[PDB]
Amino acid sequence: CSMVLDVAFVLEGSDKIGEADFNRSKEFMEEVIQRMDVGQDSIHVTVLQYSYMVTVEYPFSEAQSKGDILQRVREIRYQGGNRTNTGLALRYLSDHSFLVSQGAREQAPNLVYMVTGNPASDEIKRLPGDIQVVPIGVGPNANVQELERIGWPNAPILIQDFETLPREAPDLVLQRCSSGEGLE
Ligand code: NA
Numbered sequence: 001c002s003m004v005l006d007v008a009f010v011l012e013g014s015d016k017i018g019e020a021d022f023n024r025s026k027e028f029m030e031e032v033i034q035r036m037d038v039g040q041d042s043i044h045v046t047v048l049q050y051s052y053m054v055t056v057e058y059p060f061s062e063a064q065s066k067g068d069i070l071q072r073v074r075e076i077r078y079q080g081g082n083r084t085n086t087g088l089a090l091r092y093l094s095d096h097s098f099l100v101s102q103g104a105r106e107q108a109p110n111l112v113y114m115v116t117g118n119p120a121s122d123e124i125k126r127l128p129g130d131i132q133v134v135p136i137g138v139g140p141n142a143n144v145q146e147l148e149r150i151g152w153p154n155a156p157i158l159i160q161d162f163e164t165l166p167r168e169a170p171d172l173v174l175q176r177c178s179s180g181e182g183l184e
Contacts, residue, residue, distance in 0.1 A: 001177035002037035006044050006060060006104050008097055009033075010089050010114040013079045014051035016141070017117055021162035022078045025115050025138075028166040030073055032113070032173050038066040043177075044105065045069050046097050050089040051081025056096070060103030086120035090150070094127050113173055114150075117162070119143035124150060134176055136169060138162055155182045 009032075011025045029047070036043045044064045047057040058072050093112060098104045112133040118141050126149070127133060135147040135156040147156040157172050159165050176182055 001035070001174050002042055003178070004042060004105070004108045005177070006046070006098065006108045006110050007036070007177075008046045008048065008093060008110070008112040010048045010050065010093070010112060012051065012084060012086075012116045012118065013049040013081065014084050014118065015080045015082055016084065017051075017080075017162075019078045019080065021117070021138075022080075024162040024165055026073060026076060028115070028169055030070060031166055031170045033066065033070060033073070035170060035174050036177065038064065038069060040064050044103075044108070046103075047073060047076070048089060048092060048097065049076060049079060050085055050092075051079050052083045052085065053079075053081065054085070054089050054092045055079065056092070060097070060105075062103070083121040084116065084118045085122045086114075086116060086150075087122040087124040089114070090124060090127055090133075093131055093133075098131055111177065115165070116147070117141055120146060126150075134173070134182070136165075136173075138165055157182070 049055045110131045115136045117138045134154045135151045137147045137156045138159045
């Protein structure tokens with residue numbers, strides 16, 4: 001995937017996820033960033049972690065080089081919160097992450113890959129259409145119809161478990177990046 005694109009990664013870092021499975025999420029994300037043409041004139045990346053609260057791990061407003069982003073990702077620490085506040089994470093995207101004042105490019109399309117394994121704890125409001133969300137629902141505890149509503153027009157990418165995530169998901173994520181649509 002090589003294009004002008006503001007990409008967000010949103011990883012659930014709750015206790016229900018656990019440190020092992022969160023690290024699998026991190027490793028999935030690293031592999032995606034490695035495959036993406038991340039650079040000042042191409043793909044830009046923001047990274048969020050959420051559970052009880054939402055942490056901006058890397059804003060668009062910081063250096064948009066693959067090396068700088070990947071190293072910050074390695075430094076991300078599992079929070080292990082007691083909630084899955086997916087609604088709050090989505091509000092961050094619309095009201096903070098994708099603002100020009102926060103480093104987003106006005107003429108770049110917006111794409112979000114959100115990794116979650118549990119039902120939302122909180123109220124979820126539908127995002128403005130200009131923020132495209134591709135939900136990645138991992139494991140048996142994902143609330144699928146909830147993800148379908150968050151994702152529209154994007155079908156959720158359903159992954160059997162966090163072990164499979166870093167192996168299977170990157171290909172699908174990059175296909176969606178380049179074409180602008182999910183498969184079949
Ligand atoms: Na943008």
